[PDB]
């Protein structure tokens, strides 16, 4: 079918955080049925970023979730047309990030277009001071919502000196399927582990790896 055991992805991300304009490109691959993927990301405009790359990392891939056959896979069913996602992220101490994403399939490659707008991060907070240490593993609750899905995640951004910055994601996943059917899942959870590795000194190059597995709520 269209989502093969090996799939490539490409991403273009444009946005701003606290007025700082940037652009990133990414490419990678994974095993959509095993829920594993890796991607290589470059900051191509606005680099070096004067904020933590961690606030972008969660915007770089829902086709690579391991769904058990008993839980319908909204994302893989949405091809060939694909799906969109819209997110609002609220950070402890201020920091609101709004994200709009398109997922398409072009010549057998997944193609992502992402728009990111971050505002009101404190000037001497760990995001704008680049004192973050990556994301804890998290569980995203998935709910049926008017023929799409609502995702809800409480994430913990690790900070220098042992603390965390609490943050909350509400995501709306919408199908772009204009011909054909989608079997809607019930309430479920997705367990995520997002790792950054192979980073350059000023985060102009970052490798992300993700493990995403669906389970019953
Ligand atoms: Mg399915
Ligand atoms: Mg902060
Ligand atoms: Mg660098």
Numbering used by the authors: 8 to 67, 71 to 227
Published text:
In this article, we developed a blue-to-red “true FT”, called mRubyFT, based on the bright mRuby2 red fluorescent protein (RFP). The blue form of mRubyFT reached its maximum at 5.7 h and completely transformed into the red form that had a maturation half-time of 15 h. The mRubyFT timer was a monomer both on PAGE and FPLC. The mRubyFT had six mutations relative to the original mRuby2 template.
To determine why mRubyFT has the blue-to-red timer properties on the molecular level and to elucidate the impact of mutations introduced during directed molecular evolution, we determined the mRubyFT crystal structure using X-ray at 1.5 Å resolution. In the crystal, mRubyFT has one protein chain per asymmetric unit, and a contact analysis revealed that the protein is a monomer at pH > 5.5, i.e., in a highly fluorescent red state. The mRubyFT chromophore formed by 68LYG70 (corresponding to 65LYG67 in the alignment) amino acids is positioned on the central helix of the β-barrel. The structure of mRubyFT demonstrates a clear electron density for a cis-isomer of the red 2-(iminomethyl)-4- (4-hydroxybenzylidene)-imidazol-5-one chromophore with coplanar geometry of imidazolic and phenolic rings. The chromophore is stabilized by four direct hydrogen bonds (H-bonds) to R72, W95, R97, and S148, and five water-mediated H-bonds to S66, Q111, T113, E146, and L204. The negative charge of the phenolic hydroxyl group of the chromophore is maintained by H202 that is stacked with the phenolic group of the chromophore. The N148S mutation in mRubyFT is favorable for the stabilization of the cis-isomer due to the strong hydrogen bond (2.4 Å) of the S148 OH-group with the phenolic hydroxyl group of the chromophore. Compared to the mRuby structure, the A222S mutation in mRubyFT resulted in the formation of two additional H-bonds of S222 with H202 and E220 (corresponding to E222 in the alignment, and E222 in EGFP). Therefore, the introduction into mRubyFT of the negatively charged D130 and positively charged R229 with a large side chain instead of N130 (N125 in eqFP611) and L229 (L224 in eqfp611), respectively, must stabilize the monomeric state and perturb potential AC and AD interfaces. In addition, based on the crystal structure data, the chromophore in mRubyFT lacks any signs of degradation and has a single cis-configuration stabilized by the N148S mutation.
